[PDB]
């Protein structure tokens, strides 16, 4: 939900690191034209852990949101954006006709269709060089077949289903030898006392009965193992509740 959305030719990298993704308000916002997610599933996205997350923003027509796929080329998929074949993420696109598509025309929205070669995957090429679509050189001036690489969408509220403004938010999840920094693991049930119960604190598991706080833990401590190498004093990770096992 970003006003003045980033267009397709100048998609901004919004790298997410040292944050905890939720993957819930993403799905519960706006009627999505296409919630396709190749490589990874959005249902298990909250359970999967990734090292780094990139987010990119496109504004393209409804006939152009299907072009965003690995191994696919077109008006947008060859010169505006390219996808690496090891992509793990989603290709979520909106149907934003109310926010964009001014009656005077959203001529600020354009797309690139001139390039001397195919776009490299995960590469941005923002240039204002006059494209030599013909044989004669341009030399700055628009010669015989020298034109700007940009073409206007002219978004207005008279267009069709496949030609309305379409806001595409694509998420890229990358994992490597570094530890995962973006996850969604926030889930914690309420606790009980004086009951034979299995417990799982911060990954470490066990069973037994519980007792409230009585000892003198340090300002920083979480583990209260005794001489007998047995877990007997633990802290609640969400609220400062010292327990005895």
């Amino acid at each position, epitope marked *: 939900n970003a006003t003045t959305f980033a267009s397709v030719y100048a998609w901004n990298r919004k790298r997410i690191s040292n944050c905890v993704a939720d993957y819930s308000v993403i799905y519960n916002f706006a009627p999505f034209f296409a919630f396709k997610c190749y490589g990874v599933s959005p249902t298990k996205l909250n359970d999967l852990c990734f090292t780094n997350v990139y987010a990119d923003s496109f504004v393209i*027509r409804g*006939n152009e949101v299907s072009q965003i796929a690995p191994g696919q*080329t*077109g008006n947008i998929a*060859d*010169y505006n954006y390219k996808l690496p074949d090891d992509f793990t993420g989603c290709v979520i696109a909106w149907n934003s006709n109310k926010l964009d598509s001014k009656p005077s025309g959203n001529y600020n929205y354009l797309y690139r269709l001139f*390039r*001397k*070669s*195919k776009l490299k995957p995960f590469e941005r090429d923002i240039s204002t060089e006059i494209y*030599q*679509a*013909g*044989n004669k050189p341009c030399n700055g001036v628009a010669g*015989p*077949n020298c*034109y700007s690489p940009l*073409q206007s*969408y*002219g978004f*207005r509220p*008279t*267009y*069709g*289903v*496949g*030609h309305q403004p379409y806001r595409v938010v694509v998420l890229s999840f990358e994992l490597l030898h570094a530890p995962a920094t973006v996850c969604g693991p926030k889930k914690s049930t309420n606790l009980v006392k004086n009951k034979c119960v299995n417990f799982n604190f911060n990954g470490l598991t066990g069973t037994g009965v519980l007792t409230e706080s009585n000892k003198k833990f340090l300002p920083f401590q979480q583990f209260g193992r005794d001489i007998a190498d047995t877990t007997d004093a633990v802290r609640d990770p969400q609220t400062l509740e010292i327990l005895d096992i």
Partner: antibody, heavy 117, light 107 residues
Framework: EVQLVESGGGLVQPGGSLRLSCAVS????????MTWARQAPGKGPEWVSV???????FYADSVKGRFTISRDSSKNILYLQMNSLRVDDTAVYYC???????????WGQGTLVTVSS | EIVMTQSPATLAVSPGERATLSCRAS??????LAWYQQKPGQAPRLLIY???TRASDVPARFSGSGSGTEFTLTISSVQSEDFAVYYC??????????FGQGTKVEI
């Protein structure tokens, strides 16, 4: 000016193969979209195949899987190889540099491609 | 894809008179319609692109109007050279477009 000269057309039996050349004078075929347009004697024209400078080639619904569109940048010649021809492929073939978004257009003279047995 | 109909298909206007043609689309595109002129035995020549602007070395008589699923092409004064065939190409998904069927204008 832009001049497009089509050659290689003629009478070819259905189920055979043919190759058409399109000499282009005015620009480079590796930097322009070349449309290989058809026109019926009774009906109007249609789009059949398109090509991109990056190597992206597209075909129509009734012509896909049979045709090959190629470019010669040194010779500046657009080539079209057609295989498994049918009776419906008897038309007049043009090389079309439509480019109608900006507002300049150039169309070739074309050749009468006749497919019959 | 989007197809079109041309009304009327039996157009016949005398020389030196205003001429009217209408194109009705099947679906809605991004207001990208091209009026093309083809003479008998000739390559088609573009007149109007986007249904609002004339082409290079094209006289000011031809004018386009309308947006959406109905478009109107108006010729101010046909003088012995504009009697030809007109197509309303729909380049809303350009370069994937569709040309017309035939609008032979008779004297």
């Amino acid at each position: 000016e832009v001049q497009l000269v089509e050659s290689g057309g003629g009478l070819v039996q259905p189920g055979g193969s043919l190759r058409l050349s399109c000499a282009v004078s005015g620009f480079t075929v590796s930097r322009n979209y070349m449309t290989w347009a058809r026109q019926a004697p009774g009906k109007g024209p249609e789009w059949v195949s398109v090509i991109y400078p990056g190597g992206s080639t597209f075909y129509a619904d009734s012509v896909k899987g049979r045709f090959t569109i190629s470019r010669d940048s040194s010779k500046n010649i657009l080539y079209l190889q057609m295989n498994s021809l049918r009776v419906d492929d008897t038309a007049v073939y043009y090389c079309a540099r439509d480019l109608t978004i900006r507002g300049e257009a150039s169309w070739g003279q074309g050749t009468l491609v006749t497919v019959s047995s | 894809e989007i197809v079109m109909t041309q009304s009327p298909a039996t157009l016949a206007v005398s020389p030196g008179e205003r001429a009217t043609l209408s194109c009705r689309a099947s679906e809605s595109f991004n207001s990208n319609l091209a009026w093309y002129q083809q003479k008998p035995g000739q390559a088609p020549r573009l007149l109007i692109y986007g249904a609002s602007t004339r082409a290079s070395d094209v006289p000011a008589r031809f004018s386009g109007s309308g947006s959406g699923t109905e478009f109107t092409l108006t010729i101010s004064s046909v003088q012995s050279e504009d009697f030809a065939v007109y197509y309303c190409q729909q380049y809303g998904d350009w370069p994937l477009w569709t040309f017309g069927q035939g609008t032979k204008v008779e004297i």
